[PDB]
Amino acid sequence: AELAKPLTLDQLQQQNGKAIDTRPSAFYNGWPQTLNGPSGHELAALNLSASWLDKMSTEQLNAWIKQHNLKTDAPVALYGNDKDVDAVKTRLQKAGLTHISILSDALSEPSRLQKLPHFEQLVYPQWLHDLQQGKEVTAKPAGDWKVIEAAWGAPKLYLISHIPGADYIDTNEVESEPLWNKVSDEQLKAMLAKHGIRHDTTVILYGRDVYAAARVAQIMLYAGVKDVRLLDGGWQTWSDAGLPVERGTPPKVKAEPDFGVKIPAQPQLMLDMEQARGLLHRQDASLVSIRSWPEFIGTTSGYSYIKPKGEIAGARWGHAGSDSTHMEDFHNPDGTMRSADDITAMWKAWNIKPEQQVSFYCGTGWRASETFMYARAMGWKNVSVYDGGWYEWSSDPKNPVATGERGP
């Protein structure tokens, strides 16, 4: 049951092996474990956090092994803390892998590590707690910062428990009837003022569901908030970390009546219907459906208030989740963002590529916003959300619709 012979990264490469980073994804993504410490993962490494194992069945681990092209007998070299490495070793042995070593020089050359181009946009619980406690942290906000819980409607779960010092935003403050598109620039200006946000205020959003926070975030980026971040995995990661909480009604926030730039500062982050239409049938652009497969093939609209079924003709499938309110294809077993390499591969399979102008949509914009935030953190330079989505598109029967089982 012991590890095979240790391998350096160069040895591993010359033997066509794979490295596996057993740390939580925050560190894999680039967050250092200590200030000014190593940032990222070894080249081409996979992330298999030991903390996920109690939420991964045999089938799920077998699926993961298959999805990552791990050959039964090819060398795998693990790194991370000793306990996590042992835990992962044991599961991989029981899964059938026959050549499991330690990566002997792992993290010893900080210069050779790989990270998310903007990992600092996807924060994690300890970081936020340390920030709140006045400690020095990596990628600290330049100045003022706010933490905000986002959800639909008046505060519910927030009243019972929330992150200390967090404000609350009802998603109905940023979008409305009749199409569930974002509110006007003037209404956004009012919302920003009321929640004490200037263009140079860092905003960290979280939700019980990530997509609620992402929706608010993407609309803030459009408006012109420069530094907008998400808590990766949302509230549940804070809860599971055992960190302190607060309760009750949202505290009074000092208003900021002057945003400091003209809204919207980043209008290119949102597309309208005609702009979205313009991305279709191209190799240098993709209009990407973040809808469940039953929605993509036209079995269900995904929404009680959307009668038309089908998909935008020419739209490429971006993956999503099991139904219209889930996003499993983008999440690790702990709810955090799946590795950039894996997201990249699933998009590449549908001809969605970083050099393209890429716009994401869904029924009304929430799931598309989550993918927008991930692509932004991944360094994709030309991404947006087509706000109207299927609700708008299908409101006109003349707009071309695709239906049924089909492929790239």
Give structural notes:
By secondary structure, this protein is an alpha/beta fold. It has three domains: 1-115, Rhodanese-like domain (Oxidized Rhodanese, domain 1, 3-Layer(aba) Sandwich), CATH 3.40.250.10; 116-260, Rhodanese-like domain (Oxidized Rhodanese, domain 1, 3-Layer(aba) Sandwich); 261-408, Rhodanese-like domain (Oxidized Rhodanese, domain 1), CATH 3.40.250.10. It has helices at residues 9-14, 25-29, 58-67, 82-94, 125-132, 157-160, 185-194, 210-223, 235-240, 273-277, 293-297, 340-348, 366-377, 389-393, and strands at residues 18-21, 46-47, 76-79, 100-102, 122-123, 145-151, 167-170, 175-176, 181-182, 202-206, 228-231, 270-271, 285-289, 311-312, 316-317, 357-361, 383-386, 401-402. Helix 13 links the parallel strand 16 and strand 17 (383-386). The strands form five sheets. The protein has a five-stranded parallel beta sheet with strand order 5-11-10-6-7. The radius of gyration is 22 Å and the shape is globular. One of its GO terms (molecular function) is thiosulfate-cyanide sulfurtransferase activity.
